Each structure stands twice: as C-alpha cells, then as structure tokens.
mmCIF file of C-alpha atoms in Angstrom:
data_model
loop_
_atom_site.group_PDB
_atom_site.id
_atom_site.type_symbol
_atom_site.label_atom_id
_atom_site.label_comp_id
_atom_site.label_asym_id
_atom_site.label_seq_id
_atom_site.Cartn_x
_atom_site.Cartn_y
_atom_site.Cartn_z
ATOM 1 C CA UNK A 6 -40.723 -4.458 75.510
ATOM 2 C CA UNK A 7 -41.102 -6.580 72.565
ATOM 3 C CA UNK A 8 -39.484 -3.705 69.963
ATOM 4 C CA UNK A 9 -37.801 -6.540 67.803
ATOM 5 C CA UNK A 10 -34.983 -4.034 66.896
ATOM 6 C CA UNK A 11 -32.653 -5.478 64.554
ATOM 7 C CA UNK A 12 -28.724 -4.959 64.516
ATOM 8 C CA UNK A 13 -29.372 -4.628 60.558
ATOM 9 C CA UNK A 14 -26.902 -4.083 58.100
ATOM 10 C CA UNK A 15 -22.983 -2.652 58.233
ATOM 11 C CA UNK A 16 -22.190 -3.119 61.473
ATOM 12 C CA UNK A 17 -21.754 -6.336 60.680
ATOM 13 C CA UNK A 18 -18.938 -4.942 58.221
ATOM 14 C CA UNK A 19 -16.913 -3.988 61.900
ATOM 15 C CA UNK A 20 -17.480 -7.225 62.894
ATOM 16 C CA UNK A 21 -15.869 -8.980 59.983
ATOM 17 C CA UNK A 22 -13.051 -6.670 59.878
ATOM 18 C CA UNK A 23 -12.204 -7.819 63.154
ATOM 19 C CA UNK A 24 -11.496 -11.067 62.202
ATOM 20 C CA UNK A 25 -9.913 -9.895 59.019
ATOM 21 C CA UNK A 26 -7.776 -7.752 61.148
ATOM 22 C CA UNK A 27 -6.768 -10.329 63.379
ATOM 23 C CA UNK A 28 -5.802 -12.664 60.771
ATOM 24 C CA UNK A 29 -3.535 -10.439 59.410
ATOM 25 C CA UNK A 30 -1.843 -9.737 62.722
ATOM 26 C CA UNK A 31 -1.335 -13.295 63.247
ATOM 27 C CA UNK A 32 0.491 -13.932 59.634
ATOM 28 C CA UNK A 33 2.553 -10.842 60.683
ATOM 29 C CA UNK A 34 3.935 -12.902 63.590
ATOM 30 C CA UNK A 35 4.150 -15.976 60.927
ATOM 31 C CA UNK A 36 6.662 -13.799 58.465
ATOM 32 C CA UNK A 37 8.179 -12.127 61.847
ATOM 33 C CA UNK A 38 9.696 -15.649 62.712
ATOM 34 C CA UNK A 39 10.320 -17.515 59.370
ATOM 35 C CA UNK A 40 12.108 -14.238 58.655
ATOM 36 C CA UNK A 41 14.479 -14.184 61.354
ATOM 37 C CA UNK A 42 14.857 -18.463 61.233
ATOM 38 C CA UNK A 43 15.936 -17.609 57.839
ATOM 39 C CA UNK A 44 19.101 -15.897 59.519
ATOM 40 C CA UNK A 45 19.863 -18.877 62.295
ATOM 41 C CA UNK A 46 21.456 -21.018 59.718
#
C-alpha cells in the first residue's frame, strides 16, 4: 500500500481518442440525415 503509481503519459492518448472517435460518429449521423432530408423535398 501507498505505491503512488501514476497512470502517466499516453494512455491518456486512448482516452482522448475516444471522445474524438465518438464525435465523429455522431456528425456521421448529422450528414446521414441532412443528406437524405435533402431528397424529401
């Protein structure tokens, strides 16, 4: 106990690429239906 070990560097880089992955997934849905309300009239 008390070992103080510290999550450190890059993994944080997995972390952020989650969210950057995840906000492109959501525009994907945003050009998905503007896309097809483009063909409604």
């Amino acid at each position: 106990k008390k070992n103080s070990y510290s999550y450190g560097w890059s993994f944080y880089f997995g972390a952020l690429s989650f969210i950057i992955a995840e906000m492109v997934g959501v525009l994907a849905v945003h050009m998905f239906i503007d896309r097809h309300k483009q063909l409604t009239g």
